[PDB]
């Protein structure tokens, strides 16, 4: 996954 801000 990923933070969306990243």
């Amino acid at each position, epitope marked *: *996954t*990923s*933070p*969306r*801000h*990243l």
Partner: antibody
Amino acid sequence: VQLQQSGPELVKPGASVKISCKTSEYTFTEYTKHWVKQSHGKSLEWIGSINPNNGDTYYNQKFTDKATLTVDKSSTTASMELRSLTFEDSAVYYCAMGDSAWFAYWGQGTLVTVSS
Amino acid sequence: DVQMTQTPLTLSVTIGQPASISCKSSQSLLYSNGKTYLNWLLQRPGQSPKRLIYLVSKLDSGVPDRFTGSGSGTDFTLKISRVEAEDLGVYYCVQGTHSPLTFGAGTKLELKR
């Protein structure tokens, strides 16, 4: 790969300015692009980040005051318009890669001098 | 905003000796997918940042191996076992689990000769 930042800018106090960043290879145009401000002699601050796919923008609340992030239709150029510029806005502004390439590639410019 | 306390602020190292830089955070950097988004960057003056460590411990593609990164949760450390002239500049930690992204103040590494 590269990020290619627009060049040095002289901007009167009160005006606005737009700084661009071109991706060299098609393969990185989809990636999230980050924007970081380094004041002279100083450390680094995060301005925000744009998703070239859909356009979603995520800002550091300190800069909603001041920064708009867009992308051209190709998503090959991510821009930053700094509105209503104060002397404290003189700095270097970087453009950096995101997603699984988070902060692996950085642009080179851009120096902004706010002065009359 | 996650506060990132980097220590020491300056470093002076005889070449061949090791270096160490610590990064402490006000919040945990563990993300709900089990990955911790903490990078180590190097900046030589005038130039732009280069990445050295990502996800706390992974070396980036070109980086020498005397660089290592460790830690978890709120304490992280970058270690250089043998420092050389090339390693000069300003080392930052940066976290990206939480928003806004926040950087350490920096660490100027100075070589002794």
